[PDB]
């Protein structure tokens, strides 16, 4: 169909909670090769977050069951096999998203705020692969997640205000990557705390547009800090 139609289709699928249809429509919009508008970039992101989030959540249930079962070999064989079928769908999704970002989203991104958004997303999706890959591949995957996040982090520190919800959202997810994926709980804390304090110090730099978003992510950063600190 035509770009405007694809988008209209994606918003209907969204309302119908049919997220794979929503993802297939936004994927075709992106393959047209034109820079996504802010609204289009948000649709594509909502769509794939829901598609991949369902598999991750299932993976965690089934992995957990496959652990708690002192074999019971058969039953464990069967949970292991199911876990593998789920990983294969999860992998295929992250690879579709990662291929879109490499080929179209990151190269076309003409503003810093965009480029930061897409590199963050690239960090996120390699992070999802890292959750589920080992142990030979695992190191090279964790490294790719880190370098996407780090490059996003240097751009946003250079180009965006500390209260920008993007810069803040990136600091949230990168600090979680340090906590959960690299098992470094002091680096997580100090990344999260520095982004919290810098936003507090430059409040005046908020606008009516988004202050609501800024303050909500700050509260999430500080929640993690209190969880990690105890």
């Amino acid at each position: 169909m035509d770009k405007n139609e694809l988008v209209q289709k994606a918003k209907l699928a969204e309302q119908a909670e049919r997220y794979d249809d929503m993802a297939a429509c936004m994927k075709s919009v992106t393959e047209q090769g034109a820079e996504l508008s802010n609204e289009e970039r948000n649709l594509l992101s909502v769509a794939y977050k829901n598609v991949v989030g369902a598999r991750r959540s299932s993976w965690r249930v089934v992995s957990s069951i496959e652990q708690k079962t002192e074999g019971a070999e058969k039953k464990q064989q069967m949970a292991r096999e199911y876990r593998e079928k789920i990983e294969t769908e999860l992998r295929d999704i992250c690879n579709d998203v990662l291929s879109l970002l490499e080929k179209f989203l990151i190269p076309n991104a003409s503003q810093a705020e965009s480029k930061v958004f897409y590199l963050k997303m690239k960090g996120d999706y390699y992070r999802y692969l890292a959750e589920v890959a080992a142990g030979d591949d695992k190191k090279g995957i964790v490294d790719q997640s880190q370098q996407a996040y780090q490059e996003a982090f240097e751009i946003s520190k250079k180009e965006m205000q500390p209260t920008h919800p993007i810069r803040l959202g990136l600091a949230l997810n990168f600090s979680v990557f340090y906590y959960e994926i690299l098992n470094s709980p002091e680096k997580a804390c100090s990344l999260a705390k520095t982004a919290f304090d810098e936003a507090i110090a430059e409040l005046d730099t908020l606008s009516e547009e988004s202050y609501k978003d800024s303050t909500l992510i700050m509260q999430l950063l500080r929640d993690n800090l209190t969880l990690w600190t105890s």
Partner: peptide, 11 residues
């Protein structure tokens, strides 16, 4: 879209 969703927020 929200916070949680635009930005695929972890935790």
């Amino acid at each position: 879209q929200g916070x949680l969703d635009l930005l695929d927020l972890a935790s």
